[model samples]
Target chain A: MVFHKKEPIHVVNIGEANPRFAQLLLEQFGGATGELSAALQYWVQSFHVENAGIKDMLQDIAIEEFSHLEMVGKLIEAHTKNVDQTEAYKSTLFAVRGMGPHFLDSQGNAWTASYLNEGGDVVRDLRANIAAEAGARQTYEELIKLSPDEGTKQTLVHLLTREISHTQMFMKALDSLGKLTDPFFGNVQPDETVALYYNLSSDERGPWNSEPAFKYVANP
Target chain B: MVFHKKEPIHVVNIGEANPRFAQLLLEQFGGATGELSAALQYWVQSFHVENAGIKDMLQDIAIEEFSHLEMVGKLIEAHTKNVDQTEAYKSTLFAVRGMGPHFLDSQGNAWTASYLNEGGDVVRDLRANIAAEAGARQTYEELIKLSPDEGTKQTLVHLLTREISHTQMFMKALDSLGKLTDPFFGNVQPDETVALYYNLSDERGPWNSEPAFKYVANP
Candidate 1:
């Protein structure tokens, strides 16, 4: 579904070969909040959406995420270059297989098939995508601070700013869906349970429960 | 290496067929904090560990997680039986592939290989395991509350209790490693930045930075 691109979306520029930082960068490469998860999350959710426009948006973002994944790997390769293979592989969590971008986290935890949170609902799925972007933004921010080179920081900032743009797009799509108040309908002759927000936790009075969004029920 | 088991870890029992709840049950079957992630997390991290005893412990927990995944799928099957397949498949997020258990969350999101949080370090990996158990505990607790049948709740309780036991095992293993303070000791003649909790966030005071664990360094 994606076309092969010869050039990277953003050029990776790093002066120092900080293998430690390269290892840390693996968090975005294969971690739960990584681009791989984001790409797959959007791609899978796109299948369920009936709206053609929104579906196209999801696929577009997914394609961009794939490109971002490629850029992250390029950054990792740049950092790992010219480093001592023996010490780097032995000291860090880079060995189990080889000294390349692995499907593992910064801590060497292998990525599993449970990261993407795709609920069938368009509104909920979009919200999840927005939250994912927020998470990726925070991760890029932390990595930027840890990065020693300004060049690497620039690349991180580029990725980080893209997350914000993705969030805005998701938000716009969600808004176009109109209001979500009492979104659930059908098979509702006697069942009024969907409207009442059951007070499962302690006596909590917040906008989510007490407002016009949902009627608060102390005991139901 | 794992041996095949015919019987489920806990017997699944249900009175009524609720297809909606069955859809919700997929959260544990393949969600991020689901049993599959826990199983593979421990299995992958076990290879990096040096201690044979701890490696055995990791494998044991992973095996249990596998069984737990099986039980969750069984529970889903029980809830979806004798239901209107035509309406259920169209109404809920259960189609796309088939009616059987799928590698997907309740919302139809296919499971990807990015759920496990395995850092190579034994101490950190064990902590991640403990946190994973804690997460699974919360998910089970919520599901127990949502479940209508007492039989399903009983099985959920069994799984919830196992999470506690797993947490205890991980804690004991972590304690065996002694204290985590000043744990890093290698080529540390100059680079002392690892110790200082880089206060990148807003200025705040807490035991994490103020206590004896790490020396406070403020601008």
Candidate 2:
């Protein structure tokens, strides 16, 4: 199901039939935190957003991520252009199959349903989105690490930098949601909220709630 | 206080006058996920270790992290070898401060005390250590992304691969803890307990858990 309004997808121009790089590209394209991770994560959760507040952005990322799948899948196709496909893939649903759009990491483990955590909570979901973006950026960075090919590296840097900015988009969505959605704590919490005031957590190593006194000013 | 059995480290050997890569190197040296992040995290956590079972290993990682700090700091000095100290550091604490050591990320946020997490709980703490290793590896990979300098990249990779091995060390400690420090649910846990039947957070998210249902006989 394609989205109606936006259309800014670009061509995936990878060169040289280097299956190793193709396999590495697959990590960001179809791997766990890759292009496919957000499809159900966003679309599925879009259906259950707290009160429809975050639905649009959720669907937006969902489609865009699918678009990335096309871009990187072509990377797979390009790198497999001249190589013997039979000996390339090492594991996963693809170890024996041809390269098309396999959902697997660079090491070839199958992407799992557990990657989808549509927990019915918005704060949790958006936080998870930010975490997902961070992991994807690192994956892109790692891919860039593996392949020094100029064209591939530029494509990846573009994707990596984009993912980092996208993380900000998800974060600001959370912030704005906090502002617009409204909540009990924001509306009417006590003047002396308990956990906010003291180091309630018994573990002193973590600094958040580390003081027994006025933590609001403690700035831990 | 020295572990003395180890020889003193020598050479930062970084070439050229590039500040950006130097700033990035500072992340692993002293940043939140860097070498020193584990120092207080483990050593101090060692002091309050639930019962002292992991103390020696804890301090071992602690000192080793400090040991890495020197190698990385010299990476700093080497990178800053010919550049002006005044104009060199634009993004981090090392900018205005003296050259010895200061805590900061690549983005210049002072490394917070919050990075230290010693819950005095063994299972939780070891898990956190493993997570920290993965992050540190990624940061190394990112730095490798930035610089093509062979000497510097080589040094960083040395530290990176070394820390990940340390992660295995800790994981085995946790695994052995589960063996010797065995507890409830241990009985029903398994006989030849396959990754199929167990959460085997052993290798966590990089699934062998990517199966359909309770994969007890999943093979």
Candidate 3:
């Protein structure tokens, strides 16, 4: 049995006291690839996986991402709670146009509608996840730049760095899996012995240094 | 905090009394694609899953399979708990082969050493999974046929049916995913479609008696 603790409410309260900071927090909540998609994606595909090691890794990462969702949720709630609604509306340009406890962006975009689950196809779905992560990373960077509060900026920076790392890991996995389906036949050995080495020029020079080897006459 | 209750020892004692039944039980424990290889295969590839739905499904199933391993272990222990070593050795060739308590097969094959984790590539891995399930299903069917005890047969039959269902599911997934690839890409519908009130064939009986007639008529 595993137990998970709930995050503190203060972690995600983004009250209207600071409009700029509020907006930034809202964008992060909207953009982060949290529970909305990652968990569902991994969970759906596990049914089809056959490789033992790959399957175990998928389960491990999916649980980790679920924890990430809790973290992001806390951040959003901490920063957005108790904001002056009237002041937030006036400063945000009434862009947020949804009826709920959460305010919509000035443009009326709801934060929860960004994620989508398109069946269980890997190619199309993975592309979306990677793209989402990239967007989240960019959004966090922007938030860090716009935020005046030192604590907020530091939190955003940390989140943004995590997004960057997650993107890199996903990309590496994608590259490795992609090569498996091609002419390579899932057997990509990363070793110097199998490296491709060839010379482009037709000159009689040695391939390594591009210089012809000559025997020096010995002086007796 | 989640707490797991310890299984009763009587279950284990009952399981070990029958060596032959125990051997067969162990097969199911190792074969569910859950025991070692199946769990590893699904869990390992899940990390690299790009699709939100597929990734989540993979992780859930992989985790669930681990629970299944525990269940299978309990079932094995329940059936193999009491036979004397000397008599057991005489009755079962497994002892001669050094299987002991490790759940090794009569032929001296260990469960852990079997199966593999071939990265996160879906296509290759799915094909491998389909083959594995198919093989396991066949083994279960054979076990059911060979066993005389009705209780053992019933247990093996249930496991066999699950194997078949899992194989079909994986096969369908592979086919669906395959359709998304390049060769099948297009808005064009598949060539075959149902037709009504057609009477172009020479026989004029059923219009199109077979696929050959349809192709010939089109040409």
Q: Highest TM-score among the candidates is held by which one? A: 1
lDDT of 2 at A132: 63
**Over the stretch A1-220, how does candidate 1's per-residue lDDT look in tens digits?**
4468588965777897777787899989998778998889898988998877677668766877888899988888877776656575467765545565887879887765466666445655764675566557656767877887989887777777666556555645655665112132111121233234434222434332444534665653
Ranking by TM-score: 1, 2, 3
Chain A only: TM-score per candidate: 0.84, 0.75, 0.56
Candidate 2 lDDT score at position B206: 14
Write out fnat for all predictions, comma-separated: 0.03, 0.00, 0.00
Model 1, stretches more than 4 Å misplaced? A85-89, A179-190, A195-204, A211-220, B1-219
Model 3 error, position A62 (Å): 40
In CAPRI terms, model 2 is classed as incorrect
Ranking by lDDT: 1, 2, 3
Q: DockQ of candidates 1 onward, in order?
A: 0.04, 0.01, 0.01
User: TM-score of chain A for candidate 1?
Assistant: 0.84
Ranking by DockQ: 1, 2, 3
Off by over 4 Å in 3: A1-220, B1-16, B30-34, B89-103, B112-114, B179-219
Better candidate number, 1 or 3, judged by TM-score = 1
TM-score of each: 0.52, 0.43, 0.36
Off by over 4 Å in 2: A1-8, A50-53, A85-95, A179-206, A212-220, B1-219
Candidate 3 residue-wise lDDT, A1-220, digit = tens? 3446565312643333455455555544443333435555555555555544334434544554556556555554444445546565356522353322233332335534324322223332333344445444545555566775666665565555544444444434444467212211211122221212122111222111111211211110
- Extract clashing residue pairs from model 2: none
Q: What is the interface RMSD of candidate 3, in Å?
A: 25.2
Candidate 3, chain A: TM-score? Answer: 0.56
